[PDB]
Amino acid sequence: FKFPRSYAALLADWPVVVLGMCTLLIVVCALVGVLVPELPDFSDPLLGFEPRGTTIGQRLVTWNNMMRNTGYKATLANYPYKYAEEQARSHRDDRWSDDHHEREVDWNFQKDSFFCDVPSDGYSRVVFASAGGETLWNLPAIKSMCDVDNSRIRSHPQFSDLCQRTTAVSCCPSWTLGNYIAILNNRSSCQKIVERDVSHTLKLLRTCAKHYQNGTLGPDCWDKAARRKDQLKCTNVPRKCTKYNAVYQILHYLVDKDFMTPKTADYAVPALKYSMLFSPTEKGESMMNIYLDNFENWNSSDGITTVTGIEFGIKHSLFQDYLLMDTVYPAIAIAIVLLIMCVYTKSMFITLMTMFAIISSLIVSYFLYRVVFNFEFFPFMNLTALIILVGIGADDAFVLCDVWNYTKFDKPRAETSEAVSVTLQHAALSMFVTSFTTAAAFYANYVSNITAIRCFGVYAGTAILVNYVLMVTWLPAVIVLHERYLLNIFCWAVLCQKCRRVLFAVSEASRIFFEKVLPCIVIKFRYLWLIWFLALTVGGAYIVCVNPKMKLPSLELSEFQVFRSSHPFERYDAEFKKLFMFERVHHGEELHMPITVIWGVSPEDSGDPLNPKSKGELTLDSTFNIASPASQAWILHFCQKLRNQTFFHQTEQQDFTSCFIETFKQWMENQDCDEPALYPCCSHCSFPYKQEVFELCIKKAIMELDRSTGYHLNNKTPGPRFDINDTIRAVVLEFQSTFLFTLAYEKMQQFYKEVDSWISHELSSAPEGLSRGWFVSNLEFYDLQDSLSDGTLIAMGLSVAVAFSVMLLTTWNIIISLYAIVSIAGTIFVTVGSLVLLGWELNVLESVTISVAVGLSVDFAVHYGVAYRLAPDPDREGKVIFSLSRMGSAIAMAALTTFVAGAMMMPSTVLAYTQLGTFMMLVMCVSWAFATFFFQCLCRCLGPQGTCGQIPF
Amino acid sequence: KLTPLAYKQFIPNVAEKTLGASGRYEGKITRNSERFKELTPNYNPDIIFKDEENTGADRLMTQRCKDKLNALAISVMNQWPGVKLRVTEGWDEDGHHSEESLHYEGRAVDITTSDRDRSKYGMLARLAVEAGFDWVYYESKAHIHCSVKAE
């Protein structure tokens, strides 16, 4: 038995044991990580962008569990299906049992003067713009749009199988301006239209657009006009405007909203800025080959027109492909960080072994995350942790190598155990604090309600801590092996002439900068630096706290960007979807908020809040009762009180779904009985019906509706909900509000607080069968916005508390700790204020980067702060010169590696990669300047001397 | 003025699964499937069902099929007083049709007159396409076959 006396003696005597045990554990984590769990799925990027466990979120989960479980023989039904089956069997036995006594050519608009259908949001479509900035309303541009469709879409080998048809001989025509011109003037096709047809069509548009603007035109009257031989009179509009629905369809679908303004272009031809083409192929994953073959690598123009926007339904289908293809940019960042570190360390062995540890930290964390912590979900933004770890992982290797070189210089006679021990005393805590501040800022995001934010915090926080453990085990053992063996085991002719000389020139030029030049510039201009970095701090604080501010997300969740803004798919959702009338209508300009009230189901989420696929199961309330006379009386009174509130939209058209108990009372009052078959349901029954009469007659009334009327009940319709035995287990009421749907946070908060407080107060009066009712509406985006605001404040406050408390423990001096947080506050205001000026909003990844800015900013201030108190000089000027020379080079290298890793993400297609790269560049510039100039100027002017501000143990 | 169909005619003169007809088949529905919730039993008194299964499976159909079949029931009774629409297959759990069929997802129906008078069937198929079925086929002397798009 000869085990080493201490950890420093273990690294000194047995470094190959340490590398062997680390390598064994790393390959065991790697094998189990690829073999045991199901691999990550990125086929949906918006997966997990959901609040869980919130009040609104639990009611939205419950309402979706009700809609999933409503239908024929499901948990809930709109119809008493067992009674319907028994009633039908009773009629069969009465009659049927006796009464059933025994047992390609192109489309030609002169032949086929119609399109196969109207345009719609279900068809694949592209947006055109002018290549020369002209109006699109010219014959070359019209024919260019038809030529692009024929060349890029209809030519594709799969198009013949995808296209709509009336007959096997030909595909349907595309909805395009040239084809509407070819029916209005009766040409064969777009390819045979003429300048007089374009001009005549423009005259018809100018003439008729006033009826479109005034709502008098519409899509309707051509149906009857096509039947009649003589004339049309289903409208008061001039008959020329309705000739095929052409003017309505051109204006509502094919041209931008500003082509025919009510301020009419009477002076000169209107500027058609954008036009849309619809292909007779349905949107979705069937469009993938047409896009990838004919549109992906194309430069989107023929020199007459340009394809500026595309809507094929494949944005999220391409996302997993581009997400994985763009992993080439982190790989180039690894190569550049290796190059920087090899020149800095003067060792390819220490450099390659350090990068092995960085990549291994992400492997080991994936094993811990899926196999030990048992996360069933891996967000796509967990792949961004590679960029973070490549940039920042290096930043302990530079420090430990400097401290090792200082230790070898200070004590040349020392044993390897002494050199390791002294190096670990000087490095290990500082390396921990810069690491732990950044892990804690990631882990602080585990307080978020949003599943994907919590998951990314745990994965990235864990890789940062696993990397630290390797920097104090693997890296010291690697440094000892380099010293023992590879300081012997060292185009060949020019290596002394060029390489070694250039390395020496770089070394001494850099060293003279950090020893002489940088301390001179910091100290000589300290009054300029104090004024400048204070003025930037106030400017950044005004931009984030006063005017403007960082705004909450402005698009709705299904429109969330996932690619660079220049991508046609993104340009469609963010620029063109607001400019065409059929898309404006779909976002709900006129839409009132529904007030939905549910009884008989419990508002809860029993799924795993960390798995976005686990939404639990539907929980019925066993204490519910609608059929009691007291419940019948109170629920009628509730509908009538709600309709007297200022939040209720009292339209003249009655809706007999909205309060089903009133419609049922009115139906009972119609039963003019003269036979026993109606007996319990007769109109002489007074309203609080005996419970058996209610439970019977509600089934008779619901089936009488279904037989009498061409109207159907579906999983969203208000009314009772029956189980498999036809007992009522839930009730849904719905009313329209005076509030409109909006993406604005304070307006939607006003609706929710006004309605939920009134309903909650009123429900306290309810009989015991109705006291547990709950209100729901279209509130998912408001709950996301609410959760983004809340989670950012808590995660950032937790990060600031960690940053200050470790500062005090790192440097046992209140004054140094206070100058460090003043430098860090300035860093954060200038960093976040710059992201506000760059146009960032508090969305999912942007929210996380705000708390991560705190943990990163700590690094350079702690390094310069422990070097200030380590300094042997009695005077604060000598203490600053010592701090700058002793840490300047390693801090510069930690910053440069992180900036370089961010800069490499700029060519990426994927938005999360470019945004994180922008953040990594910007936070390193601001953090390096606020630590090197501003914090060191505070120390030079009024840094402590002797025991001043020192904290006792 | 309306014209009866010929013995093997189908009115969208293209295969049933084409986008301009009843569109793509999604997959077989069985009583244990979650898509079974989306079938609806028809109880219209204007229609006669010949469910040889005695399971009631012929009443089970999707909402668009139920809408179109109820318009056809009105149309048949309006065309011939005292004649009803008849169904011999709705959704089929027998597997008696094909290896692939719109009967297996409740989007197709096999039909006759109440009276089984085969001379009316070409006019019944005409009434089907007026009632608004998305594909209609004079499939055999025993019945017309009608089907619908997915909702």
Ligand SMILES: CCCCCCCCCCC(CCCCCCCCCC)(CO[C@@H]1O[C@H](CO)[C@@H](O[C@H]2O[C@H](CO)[C@@H](O)[C@H](O)[C@H]2O)[C@H](O)[C@H]1O)CO[C@@H]1O[C@H](CO)[C@@H](O[C@H]2O[C@H](CO)[C@@H](O)[C@H](O)[C@H]2O)[C@H](O)[C@H]1O
């Ligand atoms: C554990 C790690 C998990 C990491 C996370 C998951 C990784 C998922 C990787 C996905 C992925 C990228 C590989 C990136 C490598 C860097 C990874 C760094 C990781 C650091 C931790 C795998 O890429 C695959 O890489 C294989 C080699 O690795 C290669 O093999 C081949 O060579 C073997 C040897 O000669 C040989 O034997 C074998 O026969 C060969 O077939 C495959 O053909 C190739 O498809 C998919 O992208 C592929 O590469 C490009 C990407 O932008 C993309 O380029 C296109 O666009 C460029 C621009 O417009 C343009 O310029 C290019 O011309 C154009 O082509 C490709 O179209 C795409 O297909």
Ligand SMILES: CCCCCCCCCCC(CCCCCCCCCC)(CO[C@@H]1O[C@H](CO)[C@@H](O[C@H]2O[C@H](CO)[C@@H](O)[C@H](O)[C@H]2O)[C@H](O)[C@H]1O)CO[C@@H]1O[C@H](CO)[C@@H](O[C@H]2O[C@H](CO)[C@@H](O)[C@H](O)[C@H]2O)[C@H](O)[C@H]1O
């Ligand atoms: C889960 C419930 C879901 C209900 C869904 C209803 C669907 C619609 C059909 C409702 C219905 C038939 C159903 C009858 C059985 C109902 C049993 C229900 C039992 C369970 C609750 C109710 O017809 C009933 O008729 C009764 C007799 O006349 C009458 O009673 C009275 O009689 C006595 C004093 O004379 C006394 O006894 C009693 O007090 C009295 O009031 C009732 O008030 C009335 O509700 C017909 O109502 C008509 O529906 C039309 C649209 O189809 C609707 O059209 C308009 O709006 C459309 C847009 O909406 C729009 O497009 C149209 O252009 C537009 O023109 C009409 O405006 C509406 O009138």
Ligand SMILES: CC(C)CCC[C@@H](C)[C@H]1CC[C@H]2[C@@H]3CC=C4C[C@@H](OC(=O)CCC(=O)O)CC[C@]4(C)[C@H]3CC[C@]12C
């Ligand atoms: C690569 C991963 C997947 C597995 C790692 C497990 C083993 C291959 C490791 C674990 C401990 C290591 C051993 C730790 C200690 C020693 C003693 C050491 O003895 C000496 O006196 C040095 C001799 C010299 O090389 O000059 C020689 C290497 C050896 C056997 C090491 C070789 C590699 C070992 C067996």
Ligand SMILES: CC(C)CCC[C@@H](C)[C@H]1CC[C@H]2[C@@H]3CC=C4C[C@@H](OC(=O)CCC(=O)O)CC[C@]4(C)[C@H]3CC[C@]12C
């Ligand atoms: C377009 C992209 C792909 C170009 C990337 C080029 C970089 C990899 C080059 C450009 C300048 C180089 C730097 C020039 C000078 C130095 C100082 C040098 O300092 C020392 O060796 C230590 C001095 C001391 O003892 O303090 C460390 C490497 C570094 C940052 C070099 C690393 C490699 C750099 C960043």
Ligand SMILES: CC(C)CCC[C@@H](C)[C@H]1CC[C@H]2[C@@H]3CC=C4C[C@@H](OC(=O)CCC(=O)O)CC[C@]4(C)[C@H]3CC[C@]12C
């Ligand atoms: C970036 C990471 C993922 C690379 C890790 C690759 C591994 C397969 C390991 C196994 C053995 C290692 C090698 C062991 C010995 C040497 C000799 C060594 O030779 C020198 O000239 C050293 C000069 C110096 O650094 O001082 C250079 C590194 C290298 C190839 C090592 C680099 C990393 C290797 C190839």
Ligand SMILES: CC(C)CCC[C@@H](C)[C@H]1CC[C@H]2[C@@H]3CC=C4C[C@@H](OC(=O)CCC(=O)O)CC[C@]4(C)[C@H]3CC[C@]12C
């Ligand atoms: C090396 C460090 C940075 C990560 C350590 C964990 C890895 C072992 C995991 C993380 C992401 C995983 C990848 C995520 C996605 C894919 C795409 C997958 O191919 C697909 O087209 C199918 C994806 C799908 O299921 O939809 C092949 C495996 C791969 C590379 C996975 C292999 C295992 C990976 C690299």
Ligand SMILES: CC(C)CCC[C@@H](C)[C@H]1CC[C@H]2[C@@H]3CC=C4C[C@@H](OC(=O)CCC(=O)O)CC[C@]4(C)[C@H]3CC[C@]12C
């Ligand atoms: C995931 C788990 C397994 C990580 C475990 C990490 C520890 C094994 C490492 C982290 C930092 C290390 C310490 C870093 C610095 C030092 C100072 C060094 O010098 C002294 O303590 C001088 C005075 C004395 O020897 O008593 C001795 C080793 C020690 C305690 C190290 C012991 C081993 C530590 C605690």
Ligand SMILES: CC(C)CCC[C@@H](C)[C@H]1CC[C@H]2[C@@H]3CC=C4C[C@@H](OC(=O)CCC(=O)O)CC[C@]4(C)[C@H]3CC[C@]12C
């Ligand atoms: C421009 C700001 C917003 C970015 C933050 C970094 C600055 C603090 C750096 C960038 C370029 C630097 C300047 C570049 C060169 C010089 C020449 C230098 O000339 C000398 O005579 C002293 C040189 C020496 O000591 O030998 C005086 C400082 C100055 C103006 C530097 C001051 C510090 C500057 C403004």
Ligand SMILES: CC(C)CCC[C@@H](C)[C@H]1CC[C@H]2[C@@H]3CC=C4C[C@@H](OC(=O)CCC(=O)O)CC[C@]4(C)[C@H]3CC[C@]12C
């Ligand atoms: C962004 C928020 C968090 C800042 C809130 C606190 C600051 C307003 C305080 C903290 C430290 C203070 C500074 C500490 C040291 C100095 C150096 C001092 O320099 C001199 O007096 C130079 C002449 C001399 O040597 O006597 C001038 C004031 C100043 C900038 C102080 C101004 C007020 C500061 C910036």
Ligand SMILES: CC(C)CCC[C@@H](C)[C@H]1CC[C@H]2[C@@H]3CC=C4C[C@@H](OC(=O)CCC(=O)O)CC[C@]4(C)[C@H]3CC[C@]12C
């Ligand atoms: C304490 C020092 C070290 C750093 C500065 C911390 C905070 C003063 C800042 C940084 C980012 C800010 C957040 C950025 C974005 C928003 C969204 C904003 O959303 C709104 O509802 C605004 C009004 C509206 O949209 O109607 C609410 C404040 C909040 C959380 C901000 C609150 C104040 C924060 C946390």
Ligand SMILES: CC(C)CCC[C@@H](C)[C@H]1CC[C@H]2[C@@H]3CC=C4C[C@@H](OC(=O)CCC(=O)O)CC[C@]4(C)[C@H]3CC[C@]12C
């Ligand atoms: C020395 C440290 C503290 C700062 C790092 C270097 C500076 C040169 C950086 C820091 C922040 C940067 C700014 C951050 C944000 C913007 C907004 C950006 O967009 C707009 O002005 C238009 C959009 C909008 O204002 O809404 C143009 C570049 C600019 C001024 C950047 C220019 C370069 C700046 C001043």
Ligand SMILES: CC(C)CCC[C@@H](C)[C@H]1CC[C@H]2[C@@H]3CC=C4C[C@@H](OC(=O)CCC(=O)O)CC[C@]4(C)[C@H]3CC[C@]12C
């Ligand atoms: C915002 C973040 C990303 C900043 C990152 C740190 C940089 C500011 C550092 C990294 C390497 C440094 C360079 C390393 C070597 C030199 C040579 C040096 O040469 C001399 O002073 C000549 C002395 C002589 O030999 O006479 C001048 C500064 C410079 C360019 C350094 C300037 C500061 C640099 C660019």
Ligand SMILES: CC(C)CCC[C@@H](C)[C@H]1CC[C@H]2[C@@H]3CC=C4C[C@@H](OC(=O)CCC(=O)O)CC[C@]4(C)[C@H]3CC[C@]12C
């Ligand atoms: C950062 C904000 C939000 C909270 C802290 C507010 C105050 C408690 C700070 C602001 C400026 C600080 C002062 C800035 C400069 C100095 C000079 C310094 O002067 C000495 O004589 C040092 C020792 C010596 O040289 O003898 C002693 C600390 C003191 C009073 C600092 C004590 C703590 C102060 C008053």
Ligand SMILES: CC(C)CCC[C@@H](C)[C@H]1CC[C@H]2[C@@H]3CC=C4C[C@@H](OC(=O)CCC(=O)O)CC[C@]4(C)[C@H]3CC[C@]12C
């Ligand atoms: C107000 C409360 C809630 C703050 C609690 C947390 C910290 C900010 C406290 C805990 C202990 C405190 C320290 C306890 C003792 C001292 C020594 C005291 O005297 C000296 O520094 C002068 C010594 C000399 O004669 O040289 C000045 C305040 C200071 C640093 C205190 C500053 C504030 C500290 C760090």
Ligand SMILES: CCCCCC(=O)OC[C@@H](COP(=O)(O)OCCN)OC(=O)CCCCC
């Ligand atoms: C400074 C540490 C702060 C950590 C805060 C945090 O996010 O904790 C999340 C937990 C995982 O919690 P779970 O409930 O998912 O764990 C389930 C385990 N069967 O994971 C951890 O606590 C991991 C700690 C160990 C990392 C090496």
Ligand SMILES: *[C@@H]1O[C@H](CO)[C@@H](O)[C@H](O)[C@H]1NC(C)=O
């Ligand atoms: C265009 O339509 C008219 C009827 O309006 C028809 O007579 C004429 O033949 C058509 N043009 C051509 C070239 O056939």
